[PDB]
Amino acid sequence: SHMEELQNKLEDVVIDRNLLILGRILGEGEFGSVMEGNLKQEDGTSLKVAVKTMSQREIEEFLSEAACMKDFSHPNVIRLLGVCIEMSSIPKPMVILPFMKYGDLHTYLLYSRLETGPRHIPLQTLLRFMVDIALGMEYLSNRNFLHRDLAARNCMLRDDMTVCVADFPVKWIAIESLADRVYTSKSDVWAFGVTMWEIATRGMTPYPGVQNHEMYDYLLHGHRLKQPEDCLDELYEIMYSCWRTDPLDRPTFSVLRLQLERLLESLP
Ligand SMILES: C[C@@H]1CN(c2cnc(Nc3cc(F)c(OCC4CC4)c(F)c3)nc2NC2CCOCC2)CCN1
């Protein structure tokens, strides 16, 4: 039953606090922190992990949400390893995630433009990044899960260079979501088009010269993100279809993923 499936997912998500060692701080956000950590597995060995730290209803909602996320099983979707609820002198929820040396896609794109960072990213690799995101998003929409925060900063790079969607913002929000507050998988498609633009520009902030407060009016007048300098016309057409005014006219992730794979296969 619906209850039975939720009770199953809930049983698997919690990790004992003593099976975890918190290390150095990797980042400090507005309402949380990311720390490197060690997780002791059921086979006796320890695994390198990343721990993201963050009222009974809010904790129960967090546990329910985390249990849903741990159930995601796709190579282009981040696999949540589990959660820990620590107690202060106030509950402190902790989410256990894979340790990924290459970090977030946004930082990786910016680093590639500097001599000491990773090498210049060729077109085939940038398109492969978009294919992976489309693959993860296709999986999420098919299981009717809304991302709500799709951007290059929330996409992670695995050790084999596979991109995976994670952390399920005005310049990434669809024209109808800014006004009516309504959100569909077609709003995620809009955010995907912006993410494709971030990848093509190698990490530029969307809409240069356009302030965040004037975004709704800019879009309402038909203006959209401009085509990047060495971007293929076919690739720009794919990302432009993501920003169609009517959400119904926007393609699904499944249509977008195949359009992207075909364009990638056509590259020498
Ligand atoms: C040695 C260092 C280790 N570091 C690193 C290694 N492993 C993870 N794992 C990880 C961390 C997360 F916070 C995750 O949540 C989703 C986030 C995108 C929002 C996640 F799915 C995996 N994160 C790392 N850094 C992040 C710190 C916070 O800002 C983003 C980069 C890469 C840079 N080099």
Q: Is the Cβ–Cβ distance between 200 and 125 less than 8 Å?
A: no
| Stretch (H or E) spanning 146 | none
- 168: helix, strand or coil: coil
Which residues are CB-neighbours of 195 under 8 A, at least 6 positions away?
130, 133, 150, 151, 152, 155, 172
Cα gap 54→67, rounded to integer Å = 16
The answer to whether the CB of 111 is under 6 A from ligand 1 is no
**Going by CATH, does the domain composed of 2-98 fall within 3.30.1240.10?**
no
CA of 3 from ligand 1 middle (Å) equals 33
Cα gap 169→206, rounded to integer Å = 10
Residue type, 127: L
The verdict on whether residue 157 carries a ligand-binding annotation is no
What would the two tokens of residue 241 be?
Answer: 């279809």
3-state DSSP percent of the chain in helix, strand and coil, to 5: 45, 20, 35
Q: Classify residue 167 by burial, with Cβ atoms within 10 Å: 0-12, 13-18, 19+.
A: middle
Cα gap 33→54, rounded to integer Å = 7
The residues carrying an active-site annotation are: 149
Nearest CA to ligand 1 atom 26: 103
The residue among 133, 140, 149 whose CA lies nearest residue 196 is 133
The residue among 180, 188, 173, 97 whose CA lies nearest residue 137 is 188
Give CA torsion, residues 230, 122, 151, 10, to 10 deg: 160
The answer to whether the CB of 149 is under 6 A from ligand 1 is no
The residue among 129, 128, 105, 131 whose CA lies nearest residue 118 is 105
State the residue for tokens 């896609």. Answer: 105
The verdict on whether residue 220 carries a ligand-binding annotation is no
What would the two tokens of residue 54 be?
Answer: 């963050």
Which residues are CB-neighbours of 223 under 8 A, at least 6 positions away?
none
Residue ranges covered by each domain of the chain: 2-98, 103-266
Cα gap 127→268, rounded to integer Å = 13
96 φ/ψ angles, rounded to the nearest 5 degrees: -95, 125
Fold that domain 103-266 belongs to in CATH:
Transferase(Phosphotransferase); domain 1 (1.10.510)
Q: Is the Cβ–Cβ distance between 199 and 126 less than 8 Å?
A: yes
Cα gap 120→182, rounded to integer Å = 39
Helices marked H in 116-160: 123-142
The answer to whether the CB of 32 is under 6 A from ligand 1 is no
Q: Which of 31, 33, 34 to mutate to test the pocket of ligand 1 (most atoms within 8 A of CB)?
A: 34
- 77: helix, strand or coil: strand
What would the two tokens of residue 125 be?
Answer: 């690799």
For residue 141, count other CB atoms closer than 10 A to its CB. Answer: 19
Q: Do domains 2-98 and 103-266 have the same CATH topology?
A: no
Experimental method: X-ray
Q: Is the Cβ–Cβ distance between 150 and 192 less than 8 Å?
A: yes
81 φ/ψ angles, rounded to the nearest 5 degrees: -75, -30
Name the E strands within the chain: 20-29, 32-40, 46-53, 82-87, 91-98, 155-157, 163-165
For residue 149, count other CB atoms closer than 10 A to its CB. Answer: 16
* CA 134-75-109 angle, 5° bins: 60
Q: Classify residue 178 by burial, with Cβ atoms within 10 Å: 0-12, 13-18, 19+.
A: middle
Q: Classify residue 195 by burial, with Cβ atoms within 10 Å: 0-12, 13-18, 19+.
A: buried
CA of 204 from ligand 1 middle (Å) equals 20
| Terminal-residue alpha carbon distance, the chain | 50
What would the two tokens of residue 268 be?
Answer: 């020498």
Residue type, 115: E
